[PDB]
Amino acid sequence: ITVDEKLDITTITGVPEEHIKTRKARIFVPARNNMQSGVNNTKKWKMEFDTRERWENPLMGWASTADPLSNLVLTFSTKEDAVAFAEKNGWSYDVEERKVPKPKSKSYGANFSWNKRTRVSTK
Amino acid sequence: TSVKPIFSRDMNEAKRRVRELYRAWYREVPNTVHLFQLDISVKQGRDKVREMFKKNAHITDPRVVDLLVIKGKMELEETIKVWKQRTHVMRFFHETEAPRPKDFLSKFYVGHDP
Amino acid sequence: SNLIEVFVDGQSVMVEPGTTVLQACEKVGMQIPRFCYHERLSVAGNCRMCLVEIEKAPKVVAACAMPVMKGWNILTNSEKTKKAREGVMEFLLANHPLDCPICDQGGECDLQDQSMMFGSDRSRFLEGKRAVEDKNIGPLVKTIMTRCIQCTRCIRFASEIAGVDDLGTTGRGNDMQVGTYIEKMFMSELSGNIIDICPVGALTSKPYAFTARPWETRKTESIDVMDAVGSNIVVSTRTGEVMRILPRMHEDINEEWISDKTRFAYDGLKRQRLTEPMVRNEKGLLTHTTWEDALSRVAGMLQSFQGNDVAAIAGGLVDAEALIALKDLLNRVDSDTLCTEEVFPTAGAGTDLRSNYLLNTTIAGVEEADVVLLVGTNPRFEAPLFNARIRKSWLHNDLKVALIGSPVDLTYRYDHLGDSPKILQDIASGSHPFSQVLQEAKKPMVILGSSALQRNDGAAILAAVSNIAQKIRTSSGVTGDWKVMNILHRIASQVAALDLGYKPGVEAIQKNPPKMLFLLGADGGCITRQDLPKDCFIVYQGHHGDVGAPIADVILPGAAYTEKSATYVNTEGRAQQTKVAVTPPGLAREDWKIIRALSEIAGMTLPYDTLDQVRNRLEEVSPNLVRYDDVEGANYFQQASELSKLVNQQLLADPLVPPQLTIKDFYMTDSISRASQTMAKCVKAVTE
Amino acid sequence: KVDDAKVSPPKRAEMKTSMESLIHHFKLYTEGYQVPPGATYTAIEAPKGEFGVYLVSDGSSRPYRCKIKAPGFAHLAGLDKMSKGHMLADVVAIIGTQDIVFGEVDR
Amino acid sequence: YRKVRFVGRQKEVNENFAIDLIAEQPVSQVGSRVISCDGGGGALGHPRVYINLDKETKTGTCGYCGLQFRQ
Amino acid sequence: RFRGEHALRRYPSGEERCIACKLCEAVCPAQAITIEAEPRADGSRRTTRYDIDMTKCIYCGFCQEACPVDAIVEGPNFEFSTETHEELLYNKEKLLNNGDKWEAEIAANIQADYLYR
Amino acid sequence: TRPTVRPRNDVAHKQLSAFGEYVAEILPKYVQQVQVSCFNELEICIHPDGVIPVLTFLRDHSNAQFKSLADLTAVDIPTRQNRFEIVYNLLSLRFNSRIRVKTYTDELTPIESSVPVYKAANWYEREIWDMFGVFFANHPDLRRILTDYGFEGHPFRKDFPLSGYVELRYDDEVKRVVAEPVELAQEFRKFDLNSPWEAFPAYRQPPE
Amino acid sequence: KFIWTNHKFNLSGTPQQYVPYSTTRKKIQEWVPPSTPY
Amino acid sequence: LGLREIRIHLCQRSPGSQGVRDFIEKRYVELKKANPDLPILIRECSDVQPKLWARYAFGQEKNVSLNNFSADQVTRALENVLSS
Ligand code: SF4
Numbered sequence A: 001i002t003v004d005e006k007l008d009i010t011t012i013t014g015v016p017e018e019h020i021k022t023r024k025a026r027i028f029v030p031a032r033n034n035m036q037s038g039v040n041n042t043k044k045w046k047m048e049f050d051t052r053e054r055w056e057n058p059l060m061g062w063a064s065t066a067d068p069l070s071n072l073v074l075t076f077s078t079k080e081d082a083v084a085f086a087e088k089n090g091w092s093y094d095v096e097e098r099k100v101p102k103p104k105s106k107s108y109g110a111n112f113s114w115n116k117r118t119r120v121s122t123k
Numbered sequence B: 001t002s003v004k005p006i007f008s009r010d011m012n013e014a015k016r017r018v019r020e021l022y023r024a025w026y027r028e029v030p031n032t033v034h035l036f037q038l039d040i041s042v043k044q045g046r047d048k049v050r051e052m053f054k055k056n057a058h059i060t061d062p063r064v065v066d067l068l069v070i071k072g073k074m075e076l077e078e079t080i081k082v083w084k085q086r087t088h089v090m091r092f093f094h095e096t097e098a099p100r101p102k103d104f105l106s107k108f109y110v111g112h113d114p
Numbered sequence C: 001s002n003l004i005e006v007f008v009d010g011q012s013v014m015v016e017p018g019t020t021v022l023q024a025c026e027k028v029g030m031q032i033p034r035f036c037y038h039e040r041l042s043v044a045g046n047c048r049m050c051l052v053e054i055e056k057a058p059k060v061v062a063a064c065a066m067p068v069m070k071g072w073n074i075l076t077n078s079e080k081t082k083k084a085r086e087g088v089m090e091f092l093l094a095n096h097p098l099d100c101p102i103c104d105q106g107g108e109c110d111l112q113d114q115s116m117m118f119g120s121d122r123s124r125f126l127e128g129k130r131a132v133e134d135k136n137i138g139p140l141v142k143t144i145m146t147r148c149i150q151c152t153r154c155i156r157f158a159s160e161i162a163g164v165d166d167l168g169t170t171g172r173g174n175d176m177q178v179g180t181y182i183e184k185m186f187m188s189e190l191s192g193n194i195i196d197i198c199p200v201g202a203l204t205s206k207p208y209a210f211t212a213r214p215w216e217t218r219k220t221e222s223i224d225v226m227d228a229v230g231s232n233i234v235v236s237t238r239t240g241e242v243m244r245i246l247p248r249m250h251e252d253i254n255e256e257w258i259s260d261k262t263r264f265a266y267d268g269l270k271r272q273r274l275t276e277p278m279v280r281n282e283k284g285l286l287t288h289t290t291w292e293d294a295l296s297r298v299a300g301m302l303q304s305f306q307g308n309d310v311a312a313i314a315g316g317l318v319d320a321e322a323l324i325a326l327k328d329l330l331n332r333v334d335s336d337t338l339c340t341e342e343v344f345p346t347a348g349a350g351t352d353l354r355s356n357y358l359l360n361t362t363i364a365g366v367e368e369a370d371v372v373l374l375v376g377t378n379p380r381f382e383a384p385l386f387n388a389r390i391r392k393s394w395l396h397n398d399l400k401v402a403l404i405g406s407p408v409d410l411t412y413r414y415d416h417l418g419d420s421p422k423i424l425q426d427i428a429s430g431s432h433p434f435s436q437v438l439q440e441a442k443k444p445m446v447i448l449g450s451s452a453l454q455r456n457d458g459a460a461i462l463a464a465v466s467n468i469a470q471k472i473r474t475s476s477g478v479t480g481d482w483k484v485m486n487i488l489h490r491i492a493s494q495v496a497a498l499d500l501g502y503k504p505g506v507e508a509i510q511k512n513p514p515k516m517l518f519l520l521g522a523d524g525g526c527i528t529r530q531d532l533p534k535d536c537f538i539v540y541q542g543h544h545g546d547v548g549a550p551i552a553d554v555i556l557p558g559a560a561y562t563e564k565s566a567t568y569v570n571t572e573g574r575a576q577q578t579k580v581a582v583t584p585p586g587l588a589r590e591d592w593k594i595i596r597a598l599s600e601i602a603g604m605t606l607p608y609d610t611l612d613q614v615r616n617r618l619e620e621v622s623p624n625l626v627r628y629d630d631v632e633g634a635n636y637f638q639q640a641s642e643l644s645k646l647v648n649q650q651l652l653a654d655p656l657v658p659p660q661l662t663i664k665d666f667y668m669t670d671s672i673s674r675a676s677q678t679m680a681k682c683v684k685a686v687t688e
Numbered sequence D: 001k002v003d004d005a006k007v008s009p010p011k012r013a014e015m016k017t018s019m020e021s022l023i024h025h026f027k028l029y030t031e032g033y034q035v036p037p038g039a040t041y042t043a044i045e046a047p048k049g050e051f052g053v054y055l056v057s058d059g060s061s062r063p064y065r066c067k068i069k070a071p072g073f074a075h076l077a078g079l080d081k082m083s084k085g086h087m088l089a090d091v092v093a094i095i096g097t098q099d100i101v102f103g104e105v106d107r
Numbered sequence E: 001y002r003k004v005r006f007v008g009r010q011k012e013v014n015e016n017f018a019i020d021l022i023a024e025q026p027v028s029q030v031g032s033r034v035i036s037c038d039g040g041g042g043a044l045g046h047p048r049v050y051i052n053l054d055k056e057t058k059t060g061t062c063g064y065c066g067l068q069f070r071q
Numbered sequence F: 001r002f003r004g005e006h007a008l009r010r011y012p013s014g015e016e017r018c019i020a021c022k023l024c025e026a027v028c029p030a031q032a033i034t035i036e037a038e039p040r041a042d043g044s045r046r047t048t049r050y051d052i053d054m055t056k057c058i059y060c061g062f063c064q065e066a067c068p069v070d071a072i073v074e075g076p077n078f079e080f081s082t083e084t085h086e087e088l089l090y091n092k093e094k095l096l097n098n099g100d101k102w103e104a105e106i107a108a109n110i111q112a113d114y115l116y117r
Numbered sequence G: 001t002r003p004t005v006r007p008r009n010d011v012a013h014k015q016l017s018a019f020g021e022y023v024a025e026i027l028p029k030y031v032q033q034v035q036v037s038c039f040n041e042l043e044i045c046i047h048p049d050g051v052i053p054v055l056t057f058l059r060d061h062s063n064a065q066f067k068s069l070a071d072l073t074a075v076d077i078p079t080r081q082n083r084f085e086i087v088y089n090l091l092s093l094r095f096n097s098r099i100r101v102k103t104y105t106d107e108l109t110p111i112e113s114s115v116p117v118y119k120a121a122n123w124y125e126r127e128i129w130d131m132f133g134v135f136f137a138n139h140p141d142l143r144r145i146l147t148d149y150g151f152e153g154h155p156f157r158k159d160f161p162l163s164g165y166v167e168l169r170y171d172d173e174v175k176r177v178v179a180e181p182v183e184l185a186q187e188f189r190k191f192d193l194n195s196p197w198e199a200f201p202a203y204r205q206p207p208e
Numbered sequence H: 001k002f003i004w005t006n007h008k009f010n011l012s013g014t015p016q017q018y019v020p021y022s023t024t025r026k027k028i029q030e031w032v033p034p035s036t037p038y
Numbered sequence I: 001l002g003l004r005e006i007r008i009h010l011c012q013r014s015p016g017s018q019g020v021r022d023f024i025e026k027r028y029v030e031l032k033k034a035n036p037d038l039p040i041l042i043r044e045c046s047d048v049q050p051k052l053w054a055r056y057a058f059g060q061e062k063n064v065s066l067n068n069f070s071a072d073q074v075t076r077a078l079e080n081v082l083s084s
């Protein structure tokens, strides 16, 4: 069998060059591009790294660049394995929080009052 | 850890293996320097060998070092034969690359904090 | 308890008795299509898109406006519901023209993300397509009223939160229209914030109009700093250029709304910007040079200076990381004498647990109040979304608002109680009524504005208002904890500035003739060379050249707010960090690294290098600044209200007039607002 | 084409007249189709062999992993068995019988 | 600054411009309410779009059509 | 239906048939298109920069089958082979000129093929 | 329902529901999940203890020949707490039937390779080492295929970005073709394409 | 209409080589200092 | 100087800092009644080891680190740096 149970926090290295200690990741929730109202693009945690300089390429004006990562987003399942991926390869990060709104109390019929203020007109 | 190892068990089949192939590199550095027809001094090669082994000495867990053993041994397969046509061996030395500043006042005049 | 299990597609869930079918089906993770509905608005039903086939009924109902009875089977997908969602969204896709090559909401319109999933395959109409004409309203709302599927969503917003009663419905049957009958312009606060609400691309932004399509941007969240309440924005880049912002829809502040000023203030951000260090040259000449010329120029002058000959001011929009590297430089030389631009009176407290200095009530606790009394400010034209929460909490329950001094145009039924500073003294007694109701309320709320507190009677009204404020707190106080007395601000980097331990109000620089000054004020011209001594150098450090860069010795380029990972403080003490989206242009650098780079060319060198090591220093002074987005419960002003009674300075005699005009003061405000050609484009359209 | 037009684009004489044609034209090129999840696999007769495609679908316009099997993985690893006991001039005559094309061994 | 890259290269540039060539068109007129614009010919050119011409006698070139349309 | 050199068309008397609806960009597999648009002072939107990376261009021709107002056309002329890498990046003022070295060559091939597609 | 809809059949959906059922019955040691695809495919989820014998059981029988090893692939899945996923695909010659073997693993935990069981896995098994680092056990010759000699990346996982770090260039400084940090002429503009509103009813998630 | 006289060529440098360039606007519009007197 | 300012830290819970929460009831109203020049600072919550800072002499930190005192131990520890 050769099970040999032991314990160590798995920090793997050698596969990148230097950008372990240089950068800091970010875990957050994408929340409702507000030109419309589709809520399908919630429920999945994503990541994005540091943004570095974008200069002008002096022949066209293209957005040529250094900063070799700059485009890496993965699709996470939840907050639980969100941390566990950033530590398993081991570079710094910072975590946001999921925002869910009010439930909330909305009821038609109270928009026509005898003495209240909740009263609509000009419909 | 509910996982079986590769070769070693705990640190003592391990640390005798990293010493082991070090001699195989050590007789190789004078052997290839006249073979690949490149011209530096041979002691620079022996400094760069121990450069590579000493840097990764911050490991306190087996089967990662053993994973580097498989990486370290596979390097010798191209090395003892001729599978790196005069470029890959020169790729170890960051030679024509401009020097990184690595100093705070020096970084501040050039760059948006890279 | 107090629930009904309704089998949504044959599956139990317990809602409140009196909620909606929409909120029931959205609770179990489903989307019914939404046109005539919004959560942050009222409820009508005149699009008729949500149609579910309820079980044990031959008819079809709409989920917008009906309650839920004893537990039904809300059959979402049927062989008849899809004969309805196909049905309604075939009519309204006929009387509509063939746009979207050119419709500026072309990547997010709700006739374009519903029409693939729901609905039919082809058309059978096959000629028709009525075509109405358009008009212009203001120089912000690009206006094609042809598209206009009459979902009555912009219309109710005039009766909703923005209380301007301006729009209506003109017509009958097929031919009705939405726009204003006369050619009256529509512009106030929040007036540019309709173009998010319009669910099709019939309404859009005027400066943004023809630039780029929305599948090329990179959405990075951040915070805006042009007001004291903060914001919740999202920027969008193209090639390292800023395109536009939208509100990020946070649930405490910025609900679905945003400041109308901050929406179109990004134009001057890339218009008039200084990029490079410019040397003294001995006359009023001012030309650029090497970055390593003007560093050693002021480095030797630092060691020559000692004592109160060197000072600084800071009252603009900079972060809370460059306001420590400045502080750990000028107090490692042990020569402080430093202040801000804003005039805040300090008599008993303010720096020492601060006891009232933040807005004490939360924004979420505003809706629980019952009687509000506020003095000496214009709530409409400073902190615009603050009046929006008052407007909504004036509606939907009872809420009582009175006001003292200078009747300006607020939306709802306020009343001018009086205009003298002696009104504030007499309310500690029993006179000029309501007289008891502030004590006899259940959640009272007394708000002071910083515009009247800027005057010379500021320490007088500081104890005069807090006299009757603790009088209500010593009464009951509410039940209850319920902090009552609170205050507001209008400069973002002031509460973050003061709680580092600065002194407020220009007095220390107002008494001595110091030699060298650091300008982080900077366009607020309360300090000139007139009050200064002779031609000794003063160094400007900032980003723009409105007021203080011509009257300067050596200017320094720096990044504004959309270029650095900054940290700010709202009016309650939260910390909402901005992040880097576009890297700054020119030779400008980040505004804390320059001080350490100026430290290393000087003698003393600060013991922290990276931005984490900055935050380790930021841990040392105040630990609430690394506490993100939390307002802890700590008032402790039983003692501090007594300590200000040591000072007994009397009032003044003047009508409590704010600086805020009818409208025009809202536009030209900070630095970029003056430089923005967009605000200059619209402010000439109001005086005309 | 397939008629239901959630996959096929509509005709050119149609995408200039009606309203339903453009919204199921203009959206069909910004993003692609809507593919359901669940793995799949097939192979057909390439004229030199099988052609394995193990197309992993995720559920959006952009696919997930797309691993291909081409011939030559089997057809040239078995050159070890096939060659030995023979000449050197045999070996070039071996290779043109399996019909091995490179760029196709990029699977 | 950029002016050195074309020395002896003669700067091949366009001659005509469509910045303003709408303005030399004989701006059309009908005297009706709503008109089709399948201009350039049928099944080619810009798609069908209907315009209201009541207000300073014009249409606004339809965006797509480009030709000045009015009454 | 043979593919080849790029060109741009225009209406009768010159109008810039392009409307800058960006669809040819989003389907280019090599992203050889780059377009920055702007409201021209007359009011209708047009282009400012317009690029075809004739190096990168992999000739999927989908730009010809994606424009609604049928702007870009793969013109059938294989006349090529300049001497620098610095030249084949086509700006706009090649393409309108290159679309106006000929049109009767182009205008007859579309008119003989548009019934099929 | 109509034309232009794929006509499914039930005969192959019956026997593949029948055949794979008594497979778990006769080895309840390694099999942990069996599922039938709605278009006549079969998955047999296997914990990799039985990586050799279950193949060795499908290596030979009288009711299951299955001696045509077609496809060894490798699929990474982050956010699974055991990342990778080795998936086989084998063919019965006499019966015309497809079945796949899904065996998960992790990075450092090795896998007993199929070297005596099949000799078509000679170049396939090495590929997963070169691309992921999944060290298979007891292979006679582990080497480097389809990558260049100086990489340290194992690129087919997700953290390796689109370009590498190793944009190569030549200089006449002496003779060499030297490496350099990577520099592009263009961003590779990354779009945003996921439309909202959930076009699929059947695969609806547990709503939590 | 808008078509050339006879023809042209795809020659390398005639002297003309079309020398493709940038066709955009300066974005940031750097600040101007005030004049020579104080 | 000595000195420039002092920084009071506490915690709203974890009741070791209740001596400081008592100290404001005991000596804050009278402690600042005397010496109306020294700008002492109070911040919100260290939440573990509620230290007490002092900073002076070209910016040199001096941190007395109270863990859990009584009502007079917080009264006597403050005058050590105050008189000096
Ligand atoms: S602006 Fe158009 S879409 Fe919005 S409510 Fe009015 S008619 Fe409806």
Ligand code: SF4
Residues within 6 Å of the ligand: C096, C098, C099, C100, C103, C105, C106, C109, C110, C111, C112, C147, C200, C201, C202
């Ligand atoms: S707003 Fe809707 S209907 Fe109008 S062009 Fe855009 S997608 Fe088409």
Ligand code: SF4
Residues within 6 Å of the ligand: F017, F018, F019, F020, F021, F022, F023, F024, F025, F035, F063, F066, F067, F068, F069, F070, F071, F072
């Ligand atoms: S071909 Fe179409 S997408 Fe491309 S520039 Fe012309 S109008 Fe725009």
Ligand code: SF4
Residues within 6 Å of the ligand: F024, F027, F028, F029, F030, F031, F032, F033, F056, F057, F058, F059, F060, F061, F062, F063, F064
């Ligand atoms: S010609 Fe080919 S490569 Fe160029 S834009 Fe069109 S489809 Fe893309």
Ligand code: FES
Residues within 6 Å of the ligand: C033, C034, C035, C036, C037, C044, C045, C046, C047, C048, C049, C050, C051, C062, C063, C064
């Ligand atoms: S969705 Fe508003 S009425 Fe049906």
Ligand SMILES: [Zn+2]
Residues within 6 Å of the ligand: E036, E037, E038, E039, E046, E062, E064, E065, E066
């Ligand atoms: Zn037309």
